[PDB]
A paper describes a structure:
In the present study, we use cryoelectron microscopy to determine structures of the Desulfonema magnum (Dm) Craspase complex to gain mechanistic insights into its regulation. We used cryoelectron microscopy (cryo-EM) to analyze the Craspase complex, which resulted in two structures, one showing clear density for crRNA and all protein domains of the complex (DmCas7-11–crRNA and DmTPR-CHATfull), whereas the second lacks density for the regions of DmTPR-CHAT (DmCas7-11–crRNA and DmTPR-CHATNTD). DmTPR-CHAT makes multi-domain interactions with DmCas7-11–crRNA via its NTD and CTD, forming two major binding sites. The overall structure of D. magnum Craspase revealed that the complex adopts a ‘closed’ conformation characterized by the steric occlusion of the first segment of the spacer crRNA by the CLD.
Residue numbers in the entry:
A (entry chain A): 2 to 151
B (entry chain B): 16 to 263, 275 to 457, 463 to 693, 725 to 1015, 1022 to 1317, 1339 to 1403, 1405 to 1792
The structure:
RNA sequence: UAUGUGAUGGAACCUCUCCGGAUAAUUCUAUCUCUUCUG
């Protein structure tokens, strides 16, 4: 549904392989290391190391799409799921949200020292800080959502 | 007033609360810990010292006085007292607050005696001061009868320091006691320094208090008694001493926050960590950063005084190499070993109180932070539970009341707690994740909180209570547990016999589906040793004459050591024992003086003690059972961090612990046994993959889950006896070129274990008494499975290490064969049975071509399930095998006896010969990909070939001479032009020496019998007549040219008389020729229109010259006639010989011999042109001259041709110019021509001393020839002058007339011998490049990489060929390219760039593509399943992006060989064991004597790959023969015989086993499909016709063995051979698809040859001596039979010889 | 650096869950080396 199309359902955060059909290594790289891979046998596969256009060298723009996709699932289809399912969706979203913020905040200090000799140009800072503030908006929503359940 | 000083002396430690602002003095953090010491903070510097307020001391004195007066019925030596009030009041915690201080305990009562009122207060009321009525009064200026001042540190009244410099912060928790998990925690501060212990204050009494002498005496007596009974203040154990009663700033309450003082030199450590990380990423070894971050702490433990870090593995014979980590270059410092020492020395010099331990700790923390910042995915990280600190306090709402029960007896108990098992007390600070807590001076610490918690847990178990203490409730909790812990005092303890740093333990989490670790599963912790002594002190003050029964029961349990004290009790830690128990009882009602003498033993040690019984008790809730397991194979368990510091240099070393009561102890950690038990239970019950959140299954009950605890404790398993280690070597063998890929020698030190001499393991397992039946049955089943031998101990289990219940010699051998079937017959393989011929010599090895189809699978069978028939049936069992040798076998050991010639013994395990399983595994696997057409499991896909440029070959060479530019961008490069140079000559002197250099020997002469010999050749009589002057000349010649010239002049030169010969020759017809206009169009005189007009009458044959002249004069008109005459120069005119022409020639007074040759050259046919006739005459003259010279003098010296007196030689030899040479800037030289100016390439550089144009300069040596002769003896020297003449024939470059090899005189240098048998050198002239105006050209990046590989190739080849270092040709470079290096550049059109860089004109080509993509395109992908991206230069992009686990692996899955045997990520499903012998010492070949093997050399890849377009031939295989007898006979021979083998350093001496010697071994497998089992059985047991090949010296015929399969133990499951055979046939038909060529070739390579008449050898490069001596020689074979183009054949065809027997 | 008719903080185990695993035959023959002068 105009998404990664690898997760079986937001109710059970699983992906039954078949993610290598996508072309972007970023999509494949992330889907293998925070979701259980289903099946009862090990899965071995890969891509052809000839993919052009590079890999964009960043993770944050990718798993940020997980945050919006997971949060909207609760706000649309979260009432039918059980208590264990409700906690799993929110807890997973918080874990991925803070990782991006940690990377962005660490970039902020190392750049705030650099911007002093760059003619106080905050154009790059504004784009990054807005995303950091946008994550903090999701940070408040996630914790508040779980506090209502408990 | 009167002052009575007080003294508070702490014994071990106390607690402190930090500083708070005045507005924040009523918060939760302050009300909690209100009874602790406070911290000061001044305005000037924000620093202060702790102090004790007087209110705590007043409260303690009041409590002690209350107890004393209750115990004595209100009469303490005449001090009659009344109870008081203890109610009302307006006490406040702080003046600027409303917290209110109120009681919570019950006050004691006594009967009232005497009269007490306001006028005459009683001593108790005088101390209390209840009649002052402080209500509604501030009392700031109001006096006080009794006042308590503050208490400060004695001797440190004015000393500031800081909070972090005096105290340390610990986090302490609370345990649920139902599930052993934390619920609440908070923070504390503690002071353990010995200086900050004594506190001194004073009590001030006003004049009103001192009413008279008796009142003051009573007050002093009561105060003294109360001070005696005071026990604890501010959370510590103390005693109070009362002195004699005789005598006469701001806190900065504004807004300010400051914390996180960090530590000194933290920035320096961070910079060091950054530098180390930068170096590691520079050398791309970031996968060892965590290993280094733990190795630094290992160095912390390992001391600096005797430190010796390891080195390389000593490659070649005796030269150590560089360690992969310890020899990392860092900022032009090659040795990290020296860099670390220098950094530590600098740090020690710069800072004070700095030692090795602190530096290592800080560096380890810095590197850990750097690794976590840069190298992510190196560790696991969700921690939801274990948070929410809780502190609660509640002021009472009612009056607590009063009681009437108080203490009457006091007990003191001493003892010792000794750790019989490693312990762990976690230390965690809110602001190296876990570390063992210890004092600041290094002493290990056992806190009192842990002891009290353990005691209350045990007493609650005894009493069967369910108390949780509910933090702060409205009323005291009561109940016996708290009622007894309200009266127990426990002292803080420290280790007495240990102060060294603790060890480090590691744990991992496996992945059940793959059998390997997870992505980031790696944990570490600090662990204390075993044998540490801790003092024990207990104090019980209660109104009973005997100890409570619960305490006696707990002490009985502790005396047996049946409970755990430390944290990690799951893996059997923290077991302590109580010994030397003593006690004493005091009666405070009648023996007050005896008690007060020693203050309960906390001031003076107690004199007399009484022994306590503590009989026994068996009520404890744990059950102990012993476990014994015998291991029947060498045992290895890796300790990667320890192996990086041991000076032995071993790659893998075992784990060891320490014991304080006694040396290294070898063991298997209890964590490993717990993991094995859990895995066995999960596999048996299929619970290894179920989600374990609120599960309550068997696995979640025996071992617990995240939210619960475990019911089992596993202790360590200690080896009993005196174990010994051994060195075991390993290597990886390439499948294309059989032989080690590179220096992959792998070392290990396993404990030697044999079925006859087993290793015994002893350990304990503790299980709770509340475990249900099913869990116990599962545990028993798992223990039985482990004891049966289903799980090996430690690593390397697939190679036969650590096998349980392995006795292969119990079976009565494997006679014949069972379950035998023929794969060749059922698959209709022709096999080409053929017949062999004795008269040919065959190759020792061939190549097997690759297949077409590789069958891969995405999902192999998993490991987490014992049996799941999802797609097919899975079996598991063992196979019995037997091995015997058809030819002698060589398995060298790791120990040798010698220094120059190393002799070797057979492999053995402490005097018992055996065969390792690695060899069998390797050979079986190789045969497996041979059959199933799998991938190449070991393959050097990362390697580029070089080859060598041929001197001549459509252009042979098109390289230009160029020089590097200045210090600009390295891309630019400028062309140049080359000329001759000096600095390489022989001698410089006058012409006399040059003319005397000749005349060594070989002077040509003329003798009379030459004429007689010529007369037999039917030579012309005129030739003899003309040679008679030559006969009588009596002249000796030395050059061929002068002799030929003299012969021509004396006999007669046709060229001298050419004009009249041409004039007298008959002139005939004239015809047009296209070649005339083709080679006459150079001149512009003739127009193209004239050419077209002449071509119009094409192919016009005229009668004679007259007709052609007339046609030329008539057809061509109206133009100048000079071009008409010039056209006649190249016309084709016929030549005819007539008698009249000969007569006219004779009349011209020409020599008669010319006419004689003319007559002998009579030809009826007319010549095409005069030039043809002249060429024929020249050819005849040359033939006659050669025939004459063939009968020259017989000096036998091959008279040299005229070379030496040439002007070129004179100008080259005269100009030495050894000195006056400069290697910088433009040169100053001139072109000194030898009085002849013809063209370029003929000049020299005179170096000053035309236009005088010069630039640059070069300096290098040249090639060294190989020829055996004695010219001038001499020896090597730095003079580099030539001393020699003659030797060998120089091949001519191009030709003036004819191109042919010809002998010439050449200078040479003396042989280096002063095999040191044929050495020479030819260099005569050197090169220099002059500057030219050429635009710089960018250089491709790959050129420098090619140059580095080329330079490494020269260094390796020079080291291999043993050439002298002084005269190494070509001076290269240390690294990169410098702005000014002079190298030859090669340019093509391309994109106006340079692609390749070479140092001289003739060098190694170096390829452009890697070996990984040289497999033929008509063959399926045979690259390894686990791929490497580095085939291109894009691995850096992937590393930066981090997407490395996705681009790996073939996109289709795993090949059958990698599935069955395992890959790096998967685990193998077949295990090969050790092969033993029935007798300890089997018979040895050669009567037990050592065999001197010949020299063995490395395989050369550039023999099946001659050209750049060559493809990989295939796998390499060895044939069977009987060449070992020749090797044995050549050894054991007398030295005088030249056919013997010498004992050089490159040779080796080994021992071999005779034939028909039997060995037995077993193969264990699990989760195998039936087709895999059938194929494995067939591979192990081939047809009786064939045999295997094992061991060393395969090319010499050593190591033919045969394996017989005896039985298959598939377990309870039923198995039949028909199904196995059918499945194997189906799989083979699916794979090969009715293809037999490769199969027939493979079965031809495996045929066994027993005939003694078949000889296989090597071509033995080059052939010497006369006669034939075989066609031996790699060059001569390449010339005629094999050839480079066809060499991709006759090598893939098995059993093909190269030459016949002479 | 404390306020006097009222201090169970000795009123609280940094605890709990995790096989330092997994891959690899101690082996093995064909060249090495660049400037020669018109032959
Ligand atoms: Zn009184
Ligand atoms: Zn209680
Ligand atoms: Zn479970
Ligand atoms: Zn494979």
């Amino acid at each position: 549904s105009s998404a990664f199309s690898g997760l079986k359902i937001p109710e059970l955060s699983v992906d039954p392989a078949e993610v290598f059909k996508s072309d972007n290594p970023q999509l494949v790289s992330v889907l293998l290391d925070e979701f259980e891979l289903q099946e009862q046998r090990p899965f071995f596969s890969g891509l052809i190391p000839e993919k052009q256009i590079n890999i964009a060298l960043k993770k944050s723009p990718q798993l940020k799409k997980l945050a919006c996709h997971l949060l909207e699932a609760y706000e649309i289809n979260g009432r039918r799921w059980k208590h264990a399912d409700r906690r799993r969706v929110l807890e997973k979203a918080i874990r991925l949200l803070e990782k991006v913020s940690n990377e962005l905040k660490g970039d902020i200090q190392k750049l705030e020292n650099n911007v002093k000799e760059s003619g106080k140009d905050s154009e790059e800072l504004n784009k990054t800080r807005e995303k950091h503030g946008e994550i903090l908006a999701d940070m408040g929503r996630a914790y508040l959502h779980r506090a209502k359940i408990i | 007033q009167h002052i009575i000083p007080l003294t508070i002396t702490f014994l071990e430690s106390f607690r402190v609360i930090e500083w708070h602002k005045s507005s924040d003095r009523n918060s939760l953090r302050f009300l909690r810990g209100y009874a602790y010491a406070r911290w000061h903070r001044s305005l000037k510097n924000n620093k202060g010292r702790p102090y004790i307020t007087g209110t705590l001391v007043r409260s303690a004195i009041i409590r002690a006085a209350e107890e004393l007066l209750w115990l004595n019925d209100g009469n303490y030596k005449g001090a009659i007292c009344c109870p008081g009030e203890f109610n009302g009041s307006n006490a406040k915690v702080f003046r600027e607050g409303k917290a209110r201080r109120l009681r919570r305990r019950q006050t004691l009562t006594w009967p009232t005696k005497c009269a007490c009122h306001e006028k005459e207060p009683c001593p108790f009321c005088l101390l209390l001061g209840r009649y002052e009525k402080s209500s509604k009064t501030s009392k700031s200026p109001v006096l006080n009868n009794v006042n308590f001042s503050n208490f400060n540190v004695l001797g440190k009244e004015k000393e500031f320091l800081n909070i972090e410099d005096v105290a340390d912060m610990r986090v302490v928790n609370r345990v649920d006691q139902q599930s052993g998990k934390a619920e609440d925690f908070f923070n504390i501060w503690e002071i353990t320094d010995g200086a900050w212990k004594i506190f001194r204050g004073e009590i001030q009494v006003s004049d009103k208090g001192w009413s008279d002498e008796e009142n003051f005496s009573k007050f002093l007596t009561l105060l003294k008694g109360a001070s005696v009974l005071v026990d604890k203040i501010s959370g510590g154990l103390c005693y109070l001493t009362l002195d004699k009663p005789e005598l006469a700033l701001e806190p900065g309450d504004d807004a300010s926050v400051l914390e996180i003082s960090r530590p000194p030199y933290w920035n320096n450590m961070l910079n060091l960590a950054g530098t180390i990380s930068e170096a590691f990423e520079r050398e791309d070894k970031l996968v060892h950063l965590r290993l280094f971050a733990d190795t630094v702490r290992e160095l912390r433990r390992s001391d600096i005084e005797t430190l010796d870090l390891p080195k390389g593995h000593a490659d070649r014979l005796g030269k150590p190499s560089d360690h992969f980590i310890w020899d990392i270059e860092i900022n032009k410092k090659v040795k990290l070993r020296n860099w670390l020492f220098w950094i530590f020395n600098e740090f020690r010099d710069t800072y004070a109180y700095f030692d090795w331990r602190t530096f290592c700790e800080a560096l380890g923390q810095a590197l850990y932070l750097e690794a976590k910042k840069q190298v992510p995915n190196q560790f696991s990280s969700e921690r939801p539970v274990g948070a929410t600190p809780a502190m609660e306090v509640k002021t009472p709402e009612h009056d607590p009341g009063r009681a009437a029960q108080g203490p009457r007896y006091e007990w003191l108990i001493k003892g010792e707690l000794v750790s019989q098992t490693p312990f762990f007390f976690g230390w965690s600070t809110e602001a190296t994740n876990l570390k063992l807590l210890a004092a600041r001076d290094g002493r290990l610490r056992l806190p009192l909180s842990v002891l009290r918690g353990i005691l209350r847990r045990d007493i609650k178990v005894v009493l069967d209570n369910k108390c949780r203490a509910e933090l702060a409730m409205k009323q005291p909790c009561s109940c016996p547990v708290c009622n007894l812990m309200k009266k127990i005092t426990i002292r803080d303890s420290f280790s007495s016999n240990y102060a060294e740093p603790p060890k480090i333990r590691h744990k991992i989490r496996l992945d059940p589906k793959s059998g390997t670790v997870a992505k980031g599963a790696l944990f570490d912790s600090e662990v204390g040793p075993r044998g540490v002594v801790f003092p024990f002190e207990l104090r019980l003050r209660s109104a009973d004459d005997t100890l409570p029964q619960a305490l006696k029961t707990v002490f009985s349990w502790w005396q047996q050591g049946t409970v755990s004290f430390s944290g990690d009790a799951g893996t059997g830690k923290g077991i302590f024992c109580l010994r030397n128990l003593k006690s004493i009882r005091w009666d405070l009602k009648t023996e007050m003086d005896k008690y007060a003498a020693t203050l309960g033993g906390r001031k003076t040690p107690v004199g007399k003690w009484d022994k306590c019984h503590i009989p026994d008790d068996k009520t404890y809730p744990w059950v102990k059972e012993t476990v014994e397991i015998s291991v029947c194979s060498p045992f290895i368990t890796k300790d990667p961090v320890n192996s990086l510091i041991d000076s032995a240099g071993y790659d893998a070393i075992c784990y060891t612990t320490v014991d304080l009561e006694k040396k290294d102890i070898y063991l298997l950690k209890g964590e490993s046994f717990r993991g094995m038990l859990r895995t066995a239970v999960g596999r048996g019950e299929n619970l290894l993959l179920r989600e374990h959140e609120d599960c309550s299954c068997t696995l979640c009950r025996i071992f617990g889950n995240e939210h619960n605890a475990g019911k089992i404790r596993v202790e360590d398993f200690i080896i009993q006896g005196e174990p010994r280690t051994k060195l075991v070597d390993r290597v990886a063998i390439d499948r294309f070129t059989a032989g080690a890929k590179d220096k992959f020698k792998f070392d290990a030190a396993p404990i030697v274990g044999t079925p006859t001499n087993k290793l015994k393991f002893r350990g304990n397992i503790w299980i709770h008494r509340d475990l249900d039946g099913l869990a116990c049955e599962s545990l028993k089943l798992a223990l039985e499975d482990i004891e049966n031998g289903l799980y090996p101990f430690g690593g390397l289990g697939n190679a036969g290490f650590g096998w349980v219940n392995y006795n292969p010699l119990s079976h009565p051998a494997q006679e014949e064969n069972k379950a035998d079937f023929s794969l060749t017959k059922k698959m209709e393989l022709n096999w080409s049975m053929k017949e062999l011929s004795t008269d040919k010599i065959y190759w020792p090895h061939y190549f097997l071509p690759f297949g077409k189809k590789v069958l891969r699978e995405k999902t192999p069978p998993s490991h987490a399930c014992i049996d799941e028939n999802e797609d097919s049936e899975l079996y598991s069992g063992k196979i019995v095998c037997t091995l015997e040798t058809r030819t002698p076998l060589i398995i060298p050991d790791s120990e040798f006896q010698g220094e120059e010639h190393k002799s070797y013994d057979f492999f053995n395990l402490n005097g018992e010969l055996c065969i390792p399983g690695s060899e069998i595994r390797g050979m079986i696997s190789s045969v497996f990909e041979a059959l199933t057409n799998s991938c190449m499991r070991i393959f050097d896909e990362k390697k580029r070939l070089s080859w060598r440029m041929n001197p001549n070959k459509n252009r042979r060479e098109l390289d230009d001479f160029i020089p590097g530019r200045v210090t600009n961008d390295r891309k630019m490069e400028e062309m140049k032009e080359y000329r001759y140079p000096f600095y390489d000559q022989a001698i410089t002197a006058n012409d006399k020496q040059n003319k005397y250099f000749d005349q060594w020997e070989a002077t040509i002469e003329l003798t009379d019998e030459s004429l007689e010999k010529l007369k037999a050749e039917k030579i012309l009589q005129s030739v003899l007549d003309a040679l008679r002057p030559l006969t009588k000349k009596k002249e000796k010649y030395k050059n061929t040219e002068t002799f030929v010239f003299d012969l021509k002049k004396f006999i007669g030169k046709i060229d001298d008389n050419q004009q009249m010969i041409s004039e007298a020759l008959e002139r005939g017809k004239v015809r047009l020729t296209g070649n005339s206009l083709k080679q006459i169009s150079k001149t512009k005189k003739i127009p193209r229109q004239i050419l077209n007009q002449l071509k119009g009458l094409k192919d016009n044959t005229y009668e004679n010259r007259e007709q052609f002249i007339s046609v030329l004069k008539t057809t061509v008109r109206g133009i100048n006639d000079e071009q008409i005459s010039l056209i006649l120069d190249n016309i084709d005119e016929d030549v005819r010989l007539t008698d009249l022409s000969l007569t006219k020639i004779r009349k011209a007074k020409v020599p008669q011999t010319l006419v004689d040759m003319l007559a002998d050259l009579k030809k009826d046919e007319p010549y095409k042109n005069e030039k043809e006739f002249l060429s024929e005459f020249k050819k005849k003259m040359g033939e006659i001259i050669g025939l004459i010279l063939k009968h020259a003098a017989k000096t036998g010296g091959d008279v040299p041709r005229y070379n030496h007196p040439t002007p070129t030689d004179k100008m080259l030899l005269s100009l030495a110019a050894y000195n006056r040479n400069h290697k910088h800037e433009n040169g100053k030289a001139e072109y000194r021509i030898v009085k002849p100016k013809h063209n370029l390439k003929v000049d020299f550089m005179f170096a000053v001393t035309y236009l005088k144009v010069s630039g640059p300069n070069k300096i290098e040596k040249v090639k060294k020839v190989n020829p055996n002769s004695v010219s001038v003896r001499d020896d090597k020297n730095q003079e580099i002058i030539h001393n020699g003449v003659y030797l060998r024939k120089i091949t001519v470059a191009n030709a003036k007339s004819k191109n042919k090899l010809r002998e010439r005189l050449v200078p040479e240098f003396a042989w280096y011998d002063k095999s040191e048998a044929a050495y020479a050198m030819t260099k005569r002239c050197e090169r220099v490049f002059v500057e030219i105006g050429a635009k710089p050209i960018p250089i491709q990046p790959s050129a420098r990489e090619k140059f580095k590989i080329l330079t490494q190739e020269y260094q390796k080849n020079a080291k291999q060929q043993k050439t002298p270092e002084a005269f190494q040709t070509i001076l290269p470079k240390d690294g990169e390219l410098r702005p000014g290096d002079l190298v030859y550049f090669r340019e093509d059109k391309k994109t106006n760039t340079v692609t390749d860089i070479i140092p001289v004109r003739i060098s190694r080509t170096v390829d452009d593509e890697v070996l990984a993509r040289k497999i033929p395109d008509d063959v399926g992908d045979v690259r390894p399943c686990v791929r490497e991206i580095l085939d291109k230069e894009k691995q850096k992009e992937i590393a930066d992006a981090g997407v490395k686990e996705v681009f790996q692996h073939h996109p289709d899955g795993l090949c059958p060989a990698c599935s069955l045997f395992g890959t790096t990520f998967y685990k193998g499903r077949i295990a090969f064991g050790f092969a033993f012998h029935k007798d300890k010492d089997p018979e040895l070949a050669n009567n037990g004597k050592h065999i001197t093997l010949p020299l063995l050399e490395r395989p050369r890849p550039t023999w099946s790959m001659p050209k750049k377009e060559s493809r990989v031939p295939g796998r390499k295989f060895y044939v069977h023969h009987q060449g070992w007898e020749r090797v044995i006979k050549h050894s054991n021979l007398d030295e005088s015989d030249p056919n013997a083998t010498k004992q050089t350093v490159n040779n080796r001496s080994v021992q071999a086993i005779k034939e028909e010697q039997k060995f037995q071994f077993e193969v264990r497998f699990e989760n195998l499909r039936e087709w895999e089992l059938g194929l494995l059985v067939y591979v192990l047991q081939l047809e009786p016709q064939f045999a295997h090949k094992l061991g060393m010296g395969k090319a010499l015929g050593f190591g033919s063995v045969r394996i017989r399969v005896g039985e298959i133990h598939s377990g309870p499951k039923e198995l039949d051979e028909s199904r196995l055979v059918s499945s194997a046939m189906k799989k083979m038909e699916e794979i090969w698809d009715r293809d037999k060529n490769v199969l027939e070739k493979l079965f031809r390579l495996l045929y066994f040859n027993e005939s003694k008449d078949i000889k296989v050898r090597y071509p033995k490069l080059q052939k010497e001596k006369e006669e034939e001596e075989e066609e031996s020689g790699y060059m001569e074979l390449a010339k005629e039979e094999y050839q480079p183009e066809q060499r991709r054949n006759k090598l893939t065809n098995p059993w093909e010889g190269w030459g016949n027997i002479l």
